[PDB]
């Protein structure tokens, strides 16, 4: 029902912090309806030791206690990446961190679980839409996860990659 943040509605660049700048990257990309939106992409499958974070802007709570996070995203399919090493991955983690004000900076909070709280490891389900951008297939999955109770002025989300190839197409944060 009630939206706290929708990346799909951005009237300009996201502006989300990425750490390191070599990992996630803001890129224009498609909706499910082929509307062109801002997305974040990471695909450092040819590099060891990948730990790439992306963090939203401060989202106000506006009275909510339980937060729902709807993610649209596309994973590439390690099988479908020519010459890829065996360490390739097909999931990302989601985290939140609450705060009393917009306290985030380049180095705070630490870029790691604790102070961030892990919501879940996110993977592609077997429900989907797939189209031929021919002949490359665009497959968009949808996953919802929720967390709470949430009590402070607001919060941040984080998305962490550790050696896969994917695009986070949309994040919709809502309550009730």
């Amino acid at each position: 029902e009630e939206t706290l943040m929708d990346s799909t509605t951005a009237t300009a660049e996201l502006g989300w912090m990425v750490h390191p700048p070599s990992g996630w990257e803001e890129v224009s990309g498609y909706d499910e309806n082929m509307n062109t939106i801002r997305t974040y992409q990471v695909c450092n499958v040819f590099e060891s030791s990948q730990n790439n974070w992306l963090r939203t802007k401060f989202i106000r709570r506006r009275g909510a206690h339980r937060i729902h996070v709807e993610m649209k995203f596309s994973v590439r399919d390690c099988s479908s990446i020519p010459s890829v090493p065996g360490s390739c991955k097909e999931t990302f983690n989601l985290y939140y961190y609450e705060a009393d004000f917009d306290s985030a900076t380049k180095t705070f909070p630490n870029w790691m679980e604790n102070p961030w709280v892990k919501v879940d490891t996110i993977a592609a389900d077997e429900s989907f839409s797939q189209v031929d951008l021919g002949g490359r297939v665009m497959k968009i999955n949808t996953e919802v996860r929720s967390f709470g109770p949430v009590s402070r002025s607001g919060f941040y989300l984080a998305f962490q990659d550790y050696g896969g190839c994917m695009s986070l197409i949309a994040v919709r944060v809502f309550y009730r």
Binding site: S22, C43, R76, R136, V137, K139, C165
Partner: peptide, 9 residues
């Protein structure tokens, strides 16, 4: 399969 997502180098 999402073959439009280019690796980095």
């Amino acid at each position: 399969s999402n073959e439009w997502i280019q690796p980095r180098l």
